[PDB]
């Protein structure tokens, strides 16, 4: 029971950190007037 709880915690941390990185990667492009996000990031990375 104890080991099962810990392993569920560690996988949760992996998902949370990926969420944090997406925000900082895309934020600059949303403030420039008239700018268009590049295709690679638009679809694949920081999607």
């Amino acid at each position: 029971s104890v080991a099962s709880f810990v392993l569920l915690s560690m996988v949760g941390t992996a998902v949370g950190m990926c969420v944090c990185a997406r925000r900082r990667c895309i934020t600059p492009y949303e403030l420039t007037p008239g700018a268009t996000v590049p295709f690679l990031l638009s679809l694949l990375c920081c999607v």
Partner: protein, 151 residues
């Protein structure tokens, strides 16, 4: 005349919001609410790296937008209180022009195109240097001289 709006908090004017391109911009350190009823209901995203906030412009207000550009050759430029000089990568204003409480005003090119948004300045005897928010192709930057203080 029409593209600039006043920001008021408890009857006092703190700054201005400008309508450029397809977004509505406002410096992030300025408190208060927007005078216009329709704009007050939009949701904004904040970023303390650049002290800026932006959103998408609603449709039926589109005719009031100004134009913008990204080329900055050396020469003379204009704003509300007179002329401004750009040389060596800095904005120059003759001292005493400008007082705190006048943030959020655009700087215009020769044809009237918006090039920068000013927030604060530094103190020097004869001429003063400014801190501005500018842009380039697909990015945004912030230029800050030594010793600048917020307006």
């Amino acid at each position: 005349n029409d593209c600039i709006f006043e920001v008021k908090h408890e009857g006092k004017v703190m700054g201005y919001a400008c309508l450029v391109g397809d977004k509505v911009m406002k410096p992030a350190h300025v408190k208060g609410t927007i005078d216009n009823a329709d704009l007050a209901k939009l949701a904004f995203k904040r970023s303390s790296k650049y002290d800026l906030e932006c959103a998408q412009i609603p449709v039926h207000m589109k005719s009031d937008a100004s134009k913008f550009t990204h080329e900055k050759p050396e020469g003379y430029y204009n704003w509300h209180h007179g002329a401004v000089q750009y040389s060596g990568g800095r904005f120059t204003i003759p001292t005493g022009a400008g007082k705190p409480g006048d943030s959020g005003r655009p700087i215009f090119d020769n044809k009237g195109r918006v090039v920068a948004i000013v927030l604060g300045g530094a103190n020097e005897g004869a001429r003063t240097a400014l801190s501005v928010v500018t842009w380039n192709k697909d990015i945004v930057t912030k230029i800050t001289p030594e010793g600048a203080e917020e307006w």
